[PDB]
Nucleic acid binder design. Sequence first.
DNA 1: GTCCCTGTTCGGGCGCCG
DNA 2: GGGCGGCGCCCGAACAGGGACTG
Lengths: 554, 403
Amino acid sequence: PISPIETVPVKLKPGMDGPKVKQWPLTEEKIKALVEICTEMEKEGKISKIGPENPYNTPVFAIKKKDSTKWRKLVDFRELNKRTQDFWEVQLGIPHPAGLKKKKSVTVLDVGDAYFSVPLDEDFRKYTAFTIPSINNETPGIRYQYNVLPQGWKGSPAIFQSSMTKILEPFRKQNPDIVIYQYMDDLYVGSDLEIGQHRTKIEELRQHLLRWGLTTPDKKHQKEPPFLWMGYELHPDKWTVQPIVLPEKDSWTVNDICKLVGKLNWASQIYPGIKVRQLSKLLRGTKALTEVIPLTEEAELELAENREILKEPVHGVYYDPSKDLIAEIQKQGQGQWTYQIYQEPFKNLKTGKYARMRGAHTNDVKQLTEAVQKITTESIVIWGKTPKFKLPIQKETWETWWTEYWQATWIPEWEFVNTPPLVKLWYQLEKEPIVGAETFYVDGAANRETKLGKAGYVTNRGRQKVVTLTDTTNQKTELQAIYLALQDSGLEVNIVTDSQYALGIIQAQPDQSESELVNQIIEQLIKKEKVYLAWVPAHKGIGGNEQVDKLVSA
Amino acid sequence: IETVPVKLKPGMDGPKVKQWPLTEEKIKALVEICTEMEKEGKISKIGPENPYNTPVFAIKKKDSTKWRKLVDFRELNKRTQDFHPAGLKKKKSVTVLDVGDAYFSVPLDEDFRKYTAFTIPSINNETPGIRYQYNVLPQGWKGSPAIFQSSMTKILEPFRKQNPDIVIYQYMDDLYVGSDLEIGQHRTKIEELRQHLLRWGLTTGYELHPDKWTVQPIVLPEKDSWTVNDIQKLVGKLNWASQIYPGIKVRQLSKLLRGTKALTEVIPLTEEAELELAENREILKEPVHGVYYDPSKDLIAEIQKQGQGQWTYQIYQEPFKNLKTGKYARMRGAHTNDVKQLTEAVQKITTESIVIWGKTPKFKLPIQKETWETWWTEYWQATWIPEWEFVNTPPLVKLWYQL
DNA sequence: GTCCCTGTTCGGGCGCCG
DNA sequence: GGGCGGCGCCCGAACAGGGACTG
Ligand SMILES: Nc1nc(=O)n([C@H]2CS[C@@H](COP(=O)(O)OP(=O)(O)OP(=O)(O)O)O2)cc1F
Ligand SMILES: [Mg+2]
Ligand SMILES: [Mg+2]
């Protein structure tokens, strides 16, 4: 049937006209499928034969449905989509099984011919014109236009989702205690009723949908667990993902690596310890999606790790609102973090990974704070509740960090977990100059035109040193001078620089950097007992800085 | 009543801003409020054919059971076509009442309603978003006080006649009331203004004291003996401060540093250097010359975290020409929340900026974008929302304004 | 202003769902 | 084999902004 719901008014973008695009040849198999679909849709008023005086056309095609012997009729509406008005998408996110609470009785319903049961704006129907070619000599081929929502139009998803919400509103208002998760036309219906009063409510809901033109065929009416829903298996007290099948390809292209990383990221929602760092780094410079890439031995090892992880069986549990949410975070190297969200010690609600590299220079406390933020937002999305944290960092480390840091930073209620590798600050700059340490006035200068430079230091004990560099910059010369001073100093050193750049970098206590030079500096700083970093205005005649400025600027 | 046609700024399209995740309590309060609002005709459900959207959340006063809906209209306000009691800053006490409900008494121009669209989300995305648009003057829209100004003047004429010593000013949803009465006489007068408001259909930040807001001056250290490091830090501070105070000289203090000395060496100040330090201490007491408020420019507000619950801030319009410099303190070091303190600071600074100039500033926040956007809404208590941006400040500017 | 360096946004692949 | 919308990750390309520089 077709829903008696009022249509959604849609207009073309100002100054635009409907599409005029010739139909491309199609297989006789696909043409037979299209004629079988179209004569049935035309008998039911979902499409109407147009004749002349319809100047528009868009190419159509068909593909086999997901897991059926049925055909899906698609239209390549890309030109019309270019020329159609803008919509505001109402699908704000994707429901997650970990957000489901335990229910007495559960049903899953799929709506039949979902799009084709919702009317389309009568004024807009002209631009949806299409043609079937009917490859035979004896059959001419028929032109149709859509009276319902087409598959391939930009506006069909939002219109269908809003219309389904409209249709479900009365049933929800009459049945507040019955829960209906509504993905596009999938309906998950849970209730605290016994099986038998649940089934009568489900029949009332099916009658409600049928009165609004939406059928719920029995072939997709799931009545007993496990329920197949949103790519998951929902058992009574545990859930899981339908099996992940990683590509076992031998040689790997960019597309193969993207598919591998996507499958691993999808699997990481319930599989702990998934890492995609080296596999993703494999994608850096490649200028085409078809290029073959030799795998790094690091990438091969990481992939084998992920494989062995995926071999194990794992489930998730459902949400209990009367308990606390607990997130626990573990660290791997290379800026990778895994997390588990649960309420009872060894019963995960879900798991996840955070690996974003933010900033040219950072440390593990920054990354841990970013992971806490990410998990907070995700758990607000899924549960509307902020979780309580278990982090591998000591209260002393955190208080030191947010004492020394100049930015505002904070983490919610948390508890130290003694599972290594712990998160720690790897060095702390002194707050006052250290007595007895040698004082290094450092500087660097670079010829902006020829890109040659010098980096050097002058010490208060008489030592002076200048190093010439090529293909360098001012900032690089300053960093190189600080590195030189770290190299030639004892376990305790005072350093005076004129560089806000290098000072701001080193003050933030980084332990990892995408710059090899900063990495060398970090190693030096970790090897030192005490370091004090003072700043002075450049080119002001401040003693010490003036001597190095005169030496480095030959 | 008939509406007032409102247009957008020419060449500008409406706001298209994604709704952000809300907590369970906020979503439930929003559903209650919007249900009771659409039952009264103030808003109407819309669909996806409306291409505009602005985010929505909800706040809840401390020791209160009533939630207040807050629409982030910063973009729409920034795109709406355009349409101050200098004594208010000089009053003894000022109380801030929420008169936004009054705006619901006036219809909104029908051709403009599509621009006020907003979307309520759901926990775990159980349903798509529920979309609404306003039929009346929405709270937090810059046009709401302008369209309503005539009715407000008509309401407040007799109260002003019977109380010419009381200064009452209107910001977006807020009514500020200033008087020189005693703290009890003042509180009884506002109760007269609340009852006066209730008698016309307009239903009515605890208590301000603008004469106690203080300027934080730049200050130099006093010492009995100075090291090379001390003189270097002093010279850096004075070199930076000369951009605000042109009279500051550094030559004499800098002469003490000639040569390559160790940081912890003790340097005795010459009489010339002592004279320079004295005159610089004096120059730091004079206020800044040539700082005039431009109403057509935007107010910039910089904030710096000084540590132990101490924060410095500067309101200016062009760099180094500060309109105001101040500090905000709090209980330090027990269970402080840096983000909560930062939001309290931005609210107090915005309050001062509205009271003084009647305009909110644009905030340069010393915080990461993600941390702020994760937590700032749990501590917000104002009905306006200032525009802001996030900056990775240098530690040098922290050292400059430090105490 | 230019050069350098750094952060943010937005688009394009892939994954998953319908 | 391809058409649509949503969310996720991850990468790069544009663009913006602040600091240091030449004569
Ligand atoms: N690839 C797809 N593109 C789509 O636009 N959809 C949209 C249009 S149909 C709707 C729901 O899809 P579904 O698989 O239930 O197909 P329907 O024809 O609606 O229903 P039935 O096959 O009768 O169960 O989602 C689905 C797809 F799988
Ligand atoms: Mg279906
Ligand atoms: Mg230099």
